[PDB]
Design a protein around this ligand. Structure first.
Ligand SMILES: [Cl-]
Ligand SMILES: [Cl-]
Ligand SMILES: [Cl-]
Ligand SMILES: [Cl-]
Ligand SMILES: [Cl-]
Ligand SMILES: [Cl-]
Ligand SMILES: [Cl-]
Ligand SMILES: [Cl-]
Ligand SMILES: [Cl-]
Ligand SMILES: [Cl-]
Ligand SMILES: [Cl-]
Ligand SMILES: [Cl-]
Lengths: 673, 673
């Protein structure tokens, strides 16, 4: 069916594909990139973390004036690293001296899906019954470096299970060709939690060389038939698995971690959002000097919550339990997806598809600072059965307490009374019994196969590619920005294809159970068409917006689909056993207002746009206006010569007529069945 | 008395000192720097914006392991620029080709204080009666570039009045030696506002070459005897000036602007916080292509507010007026300062000092996103007569509406029952009649002369320097971090010298009139002593914190004091007419948790620390713990060879025994009287 597993050696040698899997290609271990000071990661369990060609600057950026710049500002790349020591000078490494520092990786095709399980103890967690073992490791969850930017791993992804513990598991590289370790490069790991300690104030620990792994959770990567379904009860009782679905485990509903004031979220539809053991501080962090700190600074955790009444002051220890939502992870015979109506009407499941539950369209959230995160709209995690203005609670780390604070926001897709296009939303403030008719509805449904999403980048619906069948058409949503926090929908997922357009397709709700729609200064971003910008350069409003918005198709596929990238001007061939759906250009990330943005998974078809555009997306506002602004940046994978991988990038500024000469090419492929 | 004015030519030629002033030195126009992705600006009206030696990397950073790195990561510097065109290649500029792009400046000594006034029309505002004119210009307020980081000008500073309008008034440089213009380099200007339009929804305008200056406010820089006192009524009536103080103007209480999701604040004790004409969008912005946008995106403004009752929905147009606090700017015979008690007791004014009012210690604020700002604790702007859990209102730009949202926080210095040292704060949640006894009190008092603040960086009180007299001693506060936003107290100001220490010297209050003290995950930062870090490297608690905290003295001076910096290993001589108070090392900025931080004004004695330390400050938490963490970074001005100013910086990594070889030296000087 085309499942993939990616393995990282954390040495200069290629890792072997785990028993029962077969090699597709090898590469270098890409952790994340940082462009215009915004980080965008690649999950280490996915093929996008494995790049065939290294470079300290593997991407470039383009502006709306059709000018692209390569290695010509101040951007970063980050790579998993080897045991190689820092040179005694502690000065940045350049050229071929970089090579001994970069981890290698393997992309392998598995016969069945692959996941990680975590013990939250020093013991190895066993694989689920009937699942086969691929490797064991240490629970790696997130990381931060320059600017305290960073990214993290999904806790059910193999990428959260590193086979070698390192206080310094990654190295920082710069567009100018330098790489080094820096004292603020932090690695975050799941900590060991005793069941008896779950609802006690954490005992802080400062750990040094020789005792570090004593507090690091262990993991095992496992392969098994079927798929995973995750349910969150939003109550203090574990949910029941649907009829016929064996339960793997129950736990506590984890929404996100905050380390160094940087959120790292778990998708509520994935098993990483269901943690078996609760703590107000379930992780620790290490600096590169082999010193780790558990519950010894000012970090926090966030959990989906129950209807337990708002406390007057923070709750401590065992008073926390009634507040924490519970979850169950279940073995499913097919992949569950969410469908959203953007309407008062509940959306029906497609004909023949088994329905699992009905809910409300939960999109994103913010709390302390402007940190937060959001859900994938094709994930069941975006469909909460119970609407709640405040669906999560904050747990303040080493304090051992949890509380509701006034800056907690939830964001929900809105109902839209128009059949499909809302260019001029009307602001409103909603309370009490007037809220729910403005919250989009959803249903979670079991799909018979797989989904491929395609974007025309024109006003015309795209055709479904060969071997796939249309499910629905819509508009190309790139990301949203709520309360100054950006949240994307991967362009390879059905969440980037919305049946209804609005310049403001969401609203937000506060601790006082008041919701505000199109009343503040929030944004939506959409892939756009070749429609020329107006000569006036003034914002576009209302019905005049329609010619600018790209259309999309969501299609049913008989097998899995992926993107591969050449990092050259040549088209990369599809892997053996895979056939071609389309070709395009390697699209990595983007920023716009406030330098916020999002990006694509490099193994996702969403990182392979069929039409190169220096300005591939348009910015819209709750005010009912859209425009192209001069700070809209698109980032693409750069072309790299194998012989020059480790040499200093040669900076280049490209103009119209030579843009696509330095843009990596890609192909989208589906496993032949 | 030693007043200074700084002028920027915006060309390659030295500007002339304005009539009635005399030249001290010339240099290059430094706008801001960015280190570890955090921006720190120098107000263009101050001598710290005028650096004798240019470099694309004029600073270095040091970590707690006594290792310093120069031009060896990925940092930035920004400079006011000339009319020089971009090269046709649009590729980064290097080497001597940079020189034609950098503005020159002059630092001049004035016989009296200097300010800017703004018309908010296309007409030149007249100088106040009895004030003499120095130059006229255009109202320049803030700017953003890479990462949408940036900084801005105080609206009563000459730095807010640029003599030449430019859509692209500054250029971006990098540690690697490159400089260029980028499409996201935004300049923000005060807009023209008709009195009849003040409380109407803004009319958006997209402006192109040939009509840009039609919407740009004009300004005049003026010199006059005496000082300025600013009062905010916190009501819809203008405050009366104190007896004997002539009123210059009345206006509306401006707290901050938000452009590109980056706050730029006005000090509530300075005349820039009193804007004569209100608008929900009082500024516009330009990109470097000579295209400007007024009320055409998603920016906002924030104002001090009244007791007008919380509206159920946003208020529009003329319903806004009852909500906006009013202000008056008054001519004062001496400089008013705030003194804070950190106690239930109201602090008395020093003997002989005229008292102006009594209030509560207002420290900082956050609202949309995590943006916000704060007050200087020696400024009367930190002493609000009326405590308010929500002392400001948000105005949503081009919507033309204002509202109170649930994520608005105010932060206040706390009362502390200990005589001077609180190492273990006890968390509490406060409501209704139990709040006010926990809010520090203040009094605003007219000082007979000037103030100099000195830090011992030891547990011993420093001596007041020659020619000054002790006023009080305290502890060295570097900055605070509330709701993930950092807010500093310049080390050359009395606000960095607090009579009482706490790991959590503040609390925050929410829209529901509930205050939370030491209950979440906030921070305070203090200059520290030579006390060794514990071998255990574990956090320090309670009374054990005392040996680590630096002491300070606030002293009365007969004249103004400044810092000068050599950018070499040699001590810079005091200017002619000025005598030496102490020598030290050029200290620019710092970051710690979350890569947040603050910095010093380079003309302030706070940028001249007498003891160089790679780890000059310690991090404390509301939990009652303090520690040195590996991501604590100190940034210092680097040494620069005049012949190599425009050449590529040579990167250097320095170890113990050679740290001070690349650290600029400074001297603190007082005008002889
Ligand atoms: Cl770069
Ligand atoms: Cl470092
Ligand atoms: Cl912690
Ligand atoms: Cl709160
Ligand atoms: Cl909005
Ligand atoms: Cl723009
Ligand atoms: Cl650098
Ligand atoms: Cl650009
Ligand atoms: Cl605007
Ligand atoms: Cl709100
Ligand atoms: Cl706290
Ligand atoms: Cl640390």
């Amino acid at each position: 069916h085309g499942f993939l597993v990616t393995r990282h050696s954390q040495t200069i040698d290629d890792p072997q594909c785990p028993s029962g899997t077969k090699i597709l290609y090898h590469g270098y271990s890409l952790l994340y990139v940082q462009g215009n000071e915004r980080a965008h990661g690649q999950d280490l369990g996915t093929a996008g973390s494995c790049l065939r060609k290294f470079s300290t600057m593997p991407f470039l950026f383009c502006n709306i004036n059709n000018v692209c710049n390569f290695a010509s500002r101040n951007d970063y790349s980050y790579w998993l690293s080897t045991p190689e020591p820092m040179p005694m000078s502690m000065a940045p490494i350049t050229g071929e001296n970089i090579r001994p520092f970069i981890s290698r990786c393997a992309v392998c095709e598995a016969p069945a899906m692959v996941m990680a399980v975590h013990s939250q103890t020093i013991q190895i967690p066993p694989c689920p019954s009937g699942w086969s073992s691929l490797w064991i490791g240490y629970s790696f969850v997130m990381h931060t470096s320059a600017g305290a930017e960073g990214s993290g791993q999904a806790l059910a992804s193999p990428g959260s299970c590193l086979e070698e513990f390192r206080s310094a598991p990654f190295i920082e590289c710069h567009g100018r060709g330098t790489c080094n370790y820096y004292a603020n490069a932090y690695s975050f790991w799941l900590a060991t939690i005793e069941r008896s300690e779950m609802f006690k104030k954490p005992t802080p620990s400062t750990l040094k060389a020789g005792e570090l792994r004593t507090h690091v959770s262990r993991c095992q990567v496992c392969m098994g038939t079927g798929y995973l379904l995750v349910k969150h009860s939003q109550t203090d009782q574990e949910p029941m698995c649907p009829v016929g679905m064996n339960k793997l485990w129950s736990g506590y509903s984890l929404l996100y971690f905050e380390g160094q004031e940087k959120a790292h979220n778990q998708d509520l539809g994935l098993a990483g959002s269901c943690l078996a053991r609760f703590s107000t501080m379930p992780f620790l962090y290490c600096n590169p000097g082999d010193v780790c700190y558990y519950a010894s600074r000012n970090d926090k955790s966030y959990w989906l919550s129950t209807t337990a009444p708002l406390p007057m002051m923070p709750v401590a220890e065992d008073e926390i339990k009634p507040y924490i939502s519970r979850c169950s992870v279940c073995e499913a015979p097919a992949i569950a997806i969410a469908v959203h109506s953007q309407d008062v009407s509940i959306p029906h499941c497609p004909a023949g598809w088994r329905s699992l539950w009905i809910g409300y369209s939960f999109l994103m959230h913010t709390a302390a600072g402007d940190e937060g995160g959001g859900q994938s709209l094709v994930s069941p995690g975006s469909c909460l059965e119970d609407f709640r203005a405040t669906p999560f609670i904050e747990c303040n780390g080493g304090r051992g307490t949890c509380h509701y604070y006034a800056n907690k926001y939830s964001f929900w897709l809105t109902t839209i009374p128009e059949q499909s296009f809302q260019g001029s939303p009307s602001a409103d403030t909603l309370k009490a019994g007037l809220i729910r008719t403005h919250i989009s509805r959803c249903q979670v449904c079991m799909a018979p196969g797989f989904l491929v999403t395609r974007h025309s980048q024109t006003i015309d619906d795209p055709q479904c590619p060969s071997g796939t069948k249309i499910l629905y058409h819509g508009y190309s949503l790139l990301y949203v920005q709520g309360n100054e926090r950006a949240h994307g929908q991967d362009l390879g997922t059905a969440g980037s294809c919305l049946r209804k357009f609005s310049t403001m397709p969401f609203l937000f709700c506060n601790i006082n159970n008041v919701c505000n729609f199109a009343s503040r200064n929030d944004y939506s971003y959409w892939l756009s068409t070749p429609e020329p910008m107006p000569m006036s350069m003034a914002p576009i409003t209302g019905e005049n917006i329609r010619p600018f918005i790209s259309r999309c198709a969501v299609c049913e596929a008989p097998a899995m689909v992926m993107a591969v990238h050449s990092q050259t001007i040549q088209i990369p061939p599809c892997p053996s056993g895979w056939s071609s759906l389309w070709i395009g250009y390697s699209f990595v990330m983007h920023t716009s207002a406030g330098a916020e943005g999002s990006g694509q998974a490099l193994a996702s078809p969403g990182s392979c746009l069929e039409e190169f555009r220096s300005a591939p997306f348009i910015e819209c506002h709750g005010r009912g206006t859209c425009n192209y602004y001069a700070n809209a940046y698109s980032f693409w994978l750069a072309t790299i010569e194998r012989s020059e991988m480790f040499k200093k990038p040669t900076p280049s500024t490209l103009k119209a007529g030579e843009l696509r000469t330095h843009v990596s090419r890609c192909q989208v492929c589906m496993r032949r069945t």
